[PDB]
Structures are given as C-alpha cells and as structure tokens.
Symmetry: C3
C-alpha cells in the first residue's frame, strides 16, 4: 500500500519482462535457423530424387520443392520488432 | 508520483501487448512453415514410394515414412489463442 | 488513480505475464517436438533414397543425398524454456 513498495514492484516487473525479451529473441533466431536447414536438406533430396528419376528414364512422378523464406524473414522481423518492446521506466 | 507510477503501469501494459502481438505473429509463421514442410516432405515421400513401386513391377526392403505434425501445429494455434487472453486492455486498469 | 487500484493492477499485470510465459514455454516445447519429428522423417527418407541409389548402382555417381542435424537448435529451444523459468515475477507483500 506504500508508494515505495509499488515502485520497487514496478522495477521488478519491468526487469523480468526485459529479461524475457532477450531469451525469446534467441529462440526465434534458432527456430529460423532450423527452418533454413530443413529447407536446404529437403530441397537437396528433392533434387537428388528428380535427377535419379530422369537418369533412370534416359536408360508420372511429381517432385515438389519448399520455399520458407517469407516465414523465416517474419521471424527475423519479430526479433527486431521485439527490440522495440523493452520497458524504460521513468524516474 | 502517483501519476508517474500510473503512467509507468500503462507503459508496461502497452509494451507487453506489443510483445504478445509480435510473438503471436511469430507463432503463426512457424505453424505455417511447419504445414508447408509436412506437405512437401510427404509429397516427396509419395514420389519416392511411387518410384519404388514402378521399379519393382518392371527391392521390398526400402521403407518410406510419412510425417504427421498436426498435434504440434494445433498446439501452436492454441498458444496463439491462449496468448490472446493475456492481453491487458487499458480499460482493465 | 488510487494506490489500491495501482496495487490490484500490478498483481493483474504480473499474473498475465506469468501466464504468457507459461504459454510461450509450451509453444517452444511443441516446436522442439515438431523439429525432432521432421529430422527423423527427413533422414529416414534420405536413407531410403540412398539405399535405392546404391541398389540401382549395383544393378548414378552424381546423386548426392544429404542428411539433417537439428540438434543444436533443439537444445537452444530447451535452453530458452529453462531460462524463461527465471523470468517469472514473484511480487510480495
């Protein structure tokens, strides 16, 4: 019920929130990196399968490719946007 | 001071809401990426299986596996929905 | 506008923040699980393709199959869950 107690709790709240921001940023960066690796490998093996198909026909099957660039960029943008969610209290 | 404490409380709420929105967006794009991954991986598993089948009717130990991420994608959508309940509306203060 | 309302709002804010942190930890858990499932299926279909290429080459030098290792990213997601555990707010009397 004291102004001092309220002020201390407020600083605690802001500091814990700010601490969470950095951790969530790292998790977003690791998720984007994992998606990039997945795209690389899936497309490489799709290309191997396609090459195998046509090299076997040199002597019906639809291979598909993956594009996750937009989602990965949205994750990077979230990282930069969260940079702007930090709390800077007055006083 | 009472004034400044209240302004800080509202700043805290606004920053928190903006972070929640950005995190919801990130979760949406992760679920969308996961769905695309499932579609493409299963389509190429089908292609490999069809190649095996057409090769054996012209070995039977080649095992193709398929992916089901739909429980995880639904959990990401649920997280979005639940974070929607964590918003603090200024009228709540 | 009144210190008692400020105190109540402070408790409301802290509880919504803690609940959001829990939801975010859950989303990270389900993302790590989806990533592990993806690695399993992608590598199993890679090995299936490689086995097919070898059995046809013993029946193709240019065909390269690659494998996926997401272990660093998955450990970093588990790490984010663990660190976020230290971000909870314990207000007191």
């Amino acid at each position: 019920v004291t102004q001092n107690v309220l002020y201390e709790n407020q600083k605690l709240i802001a500091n814990q929130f700010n601490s969470a921001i950095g951790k969530i940023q790292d998790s977003l960066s690791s998720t984007a990196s994992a998606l990039g690796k997945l795209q690389d490998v899936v497309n490489q093996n799709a290309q191997a399968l396609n090459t195998l198909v046509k090299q076997l026909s040199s002597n019906q099957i639809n291979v598909t490719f993956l594009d996750l660039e937009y989602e990965m960029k949205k994750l990077e943008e979230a990282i930069k946007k969260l940079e702007e969610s930090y709390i800077d209290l007055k006083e």
